[PDB]
Amino acid sequence: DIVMTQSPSSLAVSAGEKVTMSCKSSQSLFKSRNQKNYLAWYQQKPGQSPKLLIYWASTRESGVPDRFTGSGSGTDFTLTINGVQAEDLAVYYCKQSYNLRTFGGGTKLELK
Amino acid sequence: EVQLVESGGGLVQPGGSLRLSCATSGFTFTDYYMSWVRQPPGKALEWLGFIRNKAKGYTTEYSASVKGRFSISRDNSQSILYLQMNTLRAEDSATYYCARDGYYADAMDYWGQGTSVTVSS
Ligand SMILES: O=C(O)[C@@]1(O)C[C@@H](O)[C@@H](O)[C@@H]([C@H](O)CO)O1
Ligand SMILES: [Mg+2]
Numbered sequence: 001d002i003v004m005t006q007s008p009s010s011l012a013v014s015a016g017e018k019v020t021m022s023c024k025s026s027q028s029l030f031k032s033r034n035q036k037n038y039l040a041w042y043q044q045k046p047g048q049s050p051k052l053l054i055y056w057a058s059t060r061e062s063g064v065p066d067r068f069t070g071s072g073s074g075t076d077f078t079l080t081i082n083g084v085q086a087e088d089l090a091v092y093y094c095k096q097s098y099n100l101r102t103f104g105g106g107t108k109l110e111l112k
Numbered sequence: 113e114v115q116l117v118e119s120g121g122g123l124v125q126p127g128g129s130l131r132l133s134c135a136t137s138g139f140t141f142t143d144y145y146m147s148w149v150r151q152p153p154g155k156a157l158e159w160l161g162f163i164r165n166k167a168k169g170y171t172t173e174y175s176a177s178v179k180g181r182f183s184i185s186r187d188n189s190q191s192i193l194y195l196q197m198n199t200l201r202a203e204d205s206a207t208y209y210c211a212r213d214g215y216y217a218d219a220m221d222y223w224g225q226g227t228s229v230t231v232s233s
Contacts, residue, residue, distance in 0.1 A: 001176070001202040040219040045182070049209060049226055050149070050157060055219035093157055097218040100173050101147065 002027050002096050004104035012110035017084050021107040023077040023094030027053040029057075030074050031098075038098035041070050041079050044106075053092075054079070086111065114138040114222045116210050121227030124200055128144030128231075132226055134193040141191040142166040145213040148184060148195045149222055152206035162213055163193070200231045 003026035013019050029038045037057035044050040053063045054070035057077060067088075070079045079092055091106040120132045134146065147162040161174040163184045177220050184198040193210050207228050211220035 036218070038218050040217075042220070044151070044157060050151075050211075050220075051223065052219055052221045055217045055221075060215075061124045061219075061221065091156075095159070097221075100162075100175070101160055101213075101220075103149075103157045105156050 003103050003104055004094060004096055004100060005091075006094060006104040006107050007058075008107060009105065010108040010110060012047070012112045013084055014112045015084060015086060015097070018080065018082050019084055019109065020080045021092060021109075023072075023079070023104055025075045025096055027098070028074045028095050029098045037073050037077075038096060039070075039072075039077055039086070040095050040097060041068075041077075042093045042095060043086075043090045044093065045087075065085050070099070081109075116212065116222055116224035118208060118210055118224045118227040121159075121208060121229045123230050123232060124197075126201055126233050127230055128200055129196065129198040130229060131201065132195040132197065132208055132227060132229070134195075135213075136191045136193065136210075138158075139212070141186075142188050143214075145187065145215075146184070146193045147211045147213040148218070149209045149211055149214075149223075150204075150206040151209075151226075152203070155206075158206075160195070165214060197201050197229070200229075205230045205232070206229065 005024045040055045041054040055063045091108045095103045115137045148160045207226040209226045212222040213220045
C-alpha cells in the first residue's frame with residue numbers, strides 16, 4: 001500500500017511570504033506510458049469542503065490562483081505558495097491517485 | 113455549474129448503519145467516477161472508496177479501512193450517489209464528503225459541502 005508523507009506537520013509564515021512544503025511517496029507515481037505523475041494537491045480550509053489545487057503534480061486546476069505551484073516527480077513533490085494570502089490558511093494535502101487514492105497526513109499552514 | 117450536496121448524516125448507535133446521499137447536478141453524472149472521503153475531528157482527510165463511470169461499468173473499490181463495511185452505489189436515473197455505512201464505530205465519526213472523480217485528471221475536482229456523522233450510544 002502506498003505511503004504518503006508530508007513535512008512539516010504544521011508551519012507558519014506572515015501574509016505575503018513564500019512557503020514550500022514537502023510530499024514524499026513510498027513508490028514512484030510516474031507512468032512512462034502517458035508521462036504523468038498520479039499526484040494531486042488539495043486545500044482544506046478549516047471546517048469546510050476541500051478544494052482541488054493541482055493535479056498531475058504540476059497542472060493547476062481551473063480557477064486556482066497562480067500563487068500556487070506544484071513541482072517534482074516520481075516520489076518527490078513540493079507545493080509552493082508564492083505570496084501567502086489570508087485566504088490560504090488551511091491544511092494542504094498531497095494525494096496519490098496511482099492505485100485507488102491515498103492522502104498524506106497534511107501540512108497545516110498557519111499565519112503570523 | 114457543478115453542484116454536489118451530501119445529506120443523511122446524523123447521530124447513529126455504535127454497530128448501526130446509515131445511508132448517506134449525494135445529489136448531483138450541472139454535469140453528465142454517468143461520465144464520472146464518484147468518491148467518498150471523510151475528515152474526522154482533528155484528523156487528516158481519508159479516502160474511503162469510489163464507484164467508476166459508465167465506460168468502466170460502475171464497479172467499486174474501497175480503502176482497507178472500510179472495505180467490507182461500507183458499500184457505494186448510484187441511482188443514475190436520479191443522478192444520485194450513496195454511501196451505505198455499516199457496523200459503525202466511534203472512529204467513524206467525521207464529516208463525509210462526496211467528490212467527482214475519474215481517469216480524466218486522476219483527481220477529485222468538485223466536492224460537496226459535507227454531512228456530519230456522529231457514532232455514539
Ligand atoms: O481504478 C481506476 O479505474 C483508474 O482508472 C483510476 C485512475 O485515476 C488511475 O488510478 C488508474 C490506475 O493508474 C490504473 O491504470 O485506475
Ligand atoms: Mg487578499
